[PDB]
């Protein structure tokens, strides 16, 4: 079979109602539809005070880069972020950010920011109108002033952006700055891709190519540094730590991740960074700091390259009679143990108690790729009634594209879901994670049981985490249970997350490393001669294979595909990089060579890395680009 990759728990609903799933639903969706979905999401779902427009803009940028037709971004972008010239969406982003962070700008900055929003909107509209008017006279003369309009707009961007980086409020203004950075970088890209059409000189063109790279670097690093500084000061419960990340990833890093890809055209970003959700409620009490994060995300991405089928676990419903003279009773619905299941018979490590038999299995009854999970309920809580009757409850429930729902207990509380995002993985944590675990991050697909310290388990508790990602172009499950990537139907480029491998050796020495502007995390090889295999469903087109990597030292890359072996020696991004410092990595796009994505064929891509210097190697992105579309720089 194909996308109808099978798995299931029991609940019926027949194929004649959800038998077909579109692996390119996002790409096949119009922007208006996407905008409506985000608006509806805002109205009815658990937004994190996130302004829905951020979702529309990111989706919009993804589509511009994903299609050669997206030569001009600024005009339409302006129409989305400044609807009919209104600054209300930007004003709301700031205000919802203030509410989310519980931080407020002083009166002076507020006033200046507002004036800058008005000016930005005006200046940008003026530029686009001048361009249009020039190409099709219908107003003011505006001679060969396009180059003149470009020079003015550019300087105006440089004068305004800094106002969204005010010391004392850098994190609070980060979402706004990201939107403004979107406008400036989009502007620069427009000049480049419309150079001939706008009468741009060769000298100006060359300068703007450097602008795209240099400003992407400055803006990217600024965003990453601002967020990292704030993240290091965190000390909060899991739910809040994850939401802080989600809020910033949706408002800021989705953009940072697309900026360094503006240099490409007709490149379908098949997936981006994950969004992790955990439950709210009084039960999940452990507090975490940034030092604990590496462990947490290394755990949440276990078996990320496999196809999620469902979970098994131990749910208990105990209602002991109330004694001591009091009336009523006390009930507790809990999930004491859990384990996530995947295609190929693979499972994650146990979560919670390791000495209990599971009494239930929750999965996508139908094929896991046909009706994947998209929404989860993870909140806990306590209900009280009568005089002394109480009920402690957990949810740990999931629902598929088909309204099929399953889990430990009835759904209630906040549900976790994001438009065009699928729950591609599930994880969880026990009531208390031992410091011994927090101090030792898991390696790639490491299977380790995460249970409460002795004197706390026996029955313990399991609190699940849903992993949301846009990833959808999955042809089917490979024979080993992993993802087979589906190439675009037409001659469009596409990416493959290094995390979605068919298989990787030296797994104990290979780790997933967090990234902020890499459309997902990277794969760090710490052992020389490690090979990562990827499998994709070709479309018969030829592409130039580019590997986005970071190597603070020398390394050798050996790529085997189509019976061809490409060797790139002396790979070192210490100083020869695009300038972006992403959590220590300094990426560079290595042109491996021309490859053929054999039609209706499962093509294997083997990436072997030699760690000459002994220093780790970061495999950050795999991108196939149309051979006749070289990068802008």
From Swiss-Prot:
It comes from the Bacteria. GO terms for biological process: sporulation resulting in formation of a cellular spore; symbiont-mediated killing of host cell. Induction: Transcribed starting in early sporulation and into later stages; not expressed during vegetative growth. Third gene in the orf1-orf2-cry2Aa (cryB1) operon. The keyword Transport does not apply. SUPFAM superfamilies: delta-Endotoxin (insectocide), middle domain, delta-Endotoxin (insectocide), N-terminal domain, Galactose-binding domain-like. GO terms for molecular function: signaling receptor binding; toxin activity. InterPro entries: Galactose-bd-like_sf, Pest_crys, Pest_crys_dom-III, Pest_crys_dom_I, Pest_crys_N_sf, Pest_cryst_cen_dom_Cry2A/18, Pest_cryst_cen_dom_sf. Toxic segment of the protein is located in the N-terminus. PANTHER family: ENDOTOXIN_N DOMAIN-CONTAINING PROTEIN-RELATED (PTHR37003), PESTICIDAL CRYSTAL PROTEIN N-TERMINAL DOMAIN-CONTAINING PROTEIN (PTHR37003:SF2). Promotes colloidosmotic lysis by binding to the midgut epithelial cells of both dipteran (Aedes aegypti) and lepidopteran (Manduca sexta) larvae. Belongs to the delta endotoxin family. This is Pesticidal crystal protein Cry2Aa. It comes from Bacillus thuringiensis subsp. kurstaki.
